[PDB]
């Protein structure tokens, strides 16, 4: 249920493959999907979730560097997958930028994203 | 044990009074503490904490505006007070800046501060 294309509310596209071993591999890109806006993503998920109706815990990371650009930062998304007719991945993320020691206090942004299978 | 002057590891001074009703009132200022660096702080704390050795939950807010400067932002600290010879207040904070709708996704920074009674 996790493998496939996901869309958030900010105009980003998430394409991922969930392996039987708990691995998440894929690409994070812009709505357009141009080569310069594609980044590698890697993560992990619970490959044997509870059967009491609970969501599936997961998380992934994207370092904002590809063969064309580098933003010297990385974002990690932590959340859970909820299946069904209106399946979604509810997450909270942390975006950390490489900073000097003096600016370390303001190195991390926090937010939340909801991904759905439909735009 | 909460009333008094506290210092974090970033050169800031926290002066607060803990009311019997659970109110926290005081001022947040720089190491120096000049008029232009003083801001009002208000918060709440658990006035009847558990007696099993648990900390005392608390939180406070500071809007970064005074009669001289305005940073159009506000920080909230959430954490707990731990008494003893080495008393401390361990917190995690969220700093939100006023932004346009387009920049709302990067409006909040997250971090952590530890306050002690000694510099």
């Amino acid at each position: 249920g996790i493998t496939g294309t996901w869309y958030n509310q900010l105009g980003s596209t998430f394409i991922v493959t969930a392996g039987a071993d708990g691995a998440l591999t894929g690409t994070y890109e812009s709505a357009v999907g141009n080569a310069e806006s594609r980044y590698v993503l890697t993560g992990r998920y619970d490959s044997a979730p509870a059967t009491d109706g609970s969501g599936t815990a997961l998380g992934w990371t994207v370092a904002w560097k590809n063969n064309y650009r580098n933003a010297h930062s990385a974002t990690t998304w932590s959340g859970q997958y909820v299946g069904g007719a209106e399946a979604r991945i509810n997450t909270q993320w942390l975006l950390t930028s490489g900073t000097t020691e003096a600016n370390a206090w303001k190195s991390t942004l926090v937010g939340h994203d909801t991904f759905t299978k439909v735009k | 044990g909460i009333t008094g002057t506290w210092y974090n590891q970033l050169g800031s001074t926290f002066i607060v009074t803990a009311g019997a009703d659970g109110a926290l009132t005081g001022t947040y200022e720089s190491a120096v503490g000049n008029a232009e660096s003083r801001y009002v702080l208000t918060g709440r704390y658990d006035s009847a904490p558990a007696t099993d050795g648990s900390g005392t939950a608390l939180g406070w807010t500071v809007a970064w505006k005074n009669n001289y400067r305005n940073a159009h932002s506000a920080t909230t600290w959430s954490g707990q007070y731990v008494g003893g010879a080495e008393a401390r207040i361990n917190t995690q904070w969220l700093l939100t800046s006023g932004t346009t709708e387009a920049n709302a996704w990067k409006s909040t920074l997250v971090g952590h501060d530890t306050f002690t009674k000694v510099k």
Binding site: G11, S12, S30, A31, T75 | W105
Partner: peptide, 13 residues
């Protein structure tokens, strides 16, 4: 408006 990959940046700023 967006100048960081995360907000869906397409072209560089």
């Amino acid at each position: 408006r967006c100048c960081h990959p995360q907000c869906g940046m397409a072209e560089e700023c």
